[PDB]
């Protein structure tokens, strides 16, 4: 089966809003959730990192900002771990530069299952959401599925591969979304 | 002709807040709302949760962490300069006896007459899960009309989540 990142309603909206407010700059933040079995990453929530960085490096991550935010979120019942990071590339589309690879490396050190999410919030206004999620591949480094090998090779080519993305919503959120509409 | 424009994310965040804190039957949750109030329509674009405690058996005792509003707003200012502190929300379902008093304390953080959003989190009714209030002498709550305005990025988000 295919590993899949499940993104909750507020996570998607906060991402979209933050990416849009940062145009023309690449903006960035952290994603909170949980890892489950091997085919499942839940993104429950997200928060923005300040644009202190010139661009989107490991340096753009504000350790004291992150800790202060995690601490205050905890006091209001948000207690999930960091499951990766997201960043926007405005108009550039969904993929990773070499700098993003490096940023992602440093996230994988902390946690082997860490995910990188790219949003293009400009292209998203065409009436469809342009997001994807990515991981590095270098661990794995006669029936088969042809499109899975085609991908596993382009993967080795650029040093990373994509994950499926889905959206979760509670029945309550569903009801509420139907009124915000 | 006072009107409120509410972004969907704000309501979704009230909801998520109320659910994650396991908010018991009769209890309520409380937060801060952020947006723009320099014009005749009030733009509510964001929110964040507060630690908050009341006494179910005594409605005149309640605790709001002032440090926390200060420290959080400070951090919101670092990501978006334009989103100011304009009011507060709670989960209701109706106006509570201590609300005027709570409202008075939020005045010290806002630059308007603070807006009170009562968010219906129980969804047991027909349309907009939100009623907007402002305090006024005429001290008593005035119902204001409100509506949903979504900056395009959010709007196709909301429609992508429903398809």
């Amino acid at each position, epitope marked *: *089966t295919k590993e899949t990142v*499940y993104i909750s309603s507020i996570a998607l909206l906060k991402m979209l809003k933050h990416g849009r407010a940062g145009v023309p700059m690449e903006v960035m933040g952290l994603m909170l959730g*949980e890892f*489950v*079995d091997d*085919y*499942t990453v*839940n993104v*429950v929530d997200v928060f923005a990192m300040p644009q202190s960085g010139t661009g989107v490096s490991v340096e753009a991550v504000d350790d004291v900002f992150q800790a202060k935010m995690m601490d205050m979120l905890k006091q209001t019942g948000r207690d*999930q771990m960091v499951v990766g990071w997201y960043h926007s590339h405005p108009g550039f589309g969904c993929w990773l530069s070499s700098v993003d690879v490096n940023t992602q490396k440093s996230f994988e050190q902390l946690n082997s299952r860490a995910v990188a999410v790219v949003v293009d919030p400009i292209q998203s206004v065409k009436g469809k959401v342009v997001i994807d999620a990515f991981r590095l591949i270098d661990t794995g480094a006669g029936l088969l599925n042809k499109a899975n090998i085609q991908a596993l090779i382009h993967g080795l080519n650029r040093h990373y591969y994509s994950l499926n993305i889905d959206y*979760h*919503k*509670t*029945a*309550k959120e569903t009801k509420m979304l139907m009124n915000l509409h | 002709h006072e009107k409120v424009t509410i972004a969907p994310l704000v309501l979704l965040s009230a909801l998520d807040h109320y*659910e*994650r804190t*396991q908010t018991k039957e009769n209890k309520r949750c409380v937060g801060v709302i952020l947006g723009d109030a320099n014009s005749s329509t009030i733009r509510v674009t964001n929110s964040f949760a507060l630690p908050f405690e009341e006494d179910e058996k005594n409605s005149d005792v309640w605790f709001l962490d002032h440090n926390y509003i200060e420290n959080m707003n400070e951090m919101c200012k670092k990501i978006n300069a334009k989103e100011k502190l304009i009011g507060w929300y709670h989960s209701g379902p109706k106006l509570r006896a201590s609300d005027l008093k709570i409202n008075e304390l939020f005045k010290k953080y806002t630059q308007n007459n603070p807006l009170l959003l009562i968010v219906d989190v129980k969804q047991q009714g027909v349309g907009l899960p939100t009623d907007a209030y402002v305090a006024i002498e005429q001290k008593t709550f005035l119902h204001l009309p409100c509506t949903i305005e979504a900056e395009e990025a959010e709007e196709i988000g909301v429609e992508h989540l429903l398809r």
Partner: nanobody
Amino acid sequence: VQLQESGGGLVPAGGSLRLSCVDSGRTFSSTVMAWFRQAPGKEREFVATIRWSGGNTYYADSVKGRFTISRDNARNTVYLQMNSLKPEDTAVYYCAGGTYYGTLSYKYDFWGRGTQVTVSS
């Protein structure tokens, strides 16, 4: 109420129980069933989760190697088989359903009323 738990009761330490939950499927559609448990004066705690289609399963650490969750999806039933029971497994057990495959109680959509398991000390 759509979910109805069953099984459960008093068992000695070391003993075995099989909990079941039947879903009537009349208000909530679900792709995921979970068991949760709540001991008095503790938080609700995640036990195990399963996908209706596929049967993928996930377990809480304190429960691995001894509990098994499974589902008879033509019969709309979920099972929690509990072996090697310890007194700290005493709690009310709730099945829940929704679309979130994971651990967080507030991400589930509907709840049974719970069934008491008492493991003798």
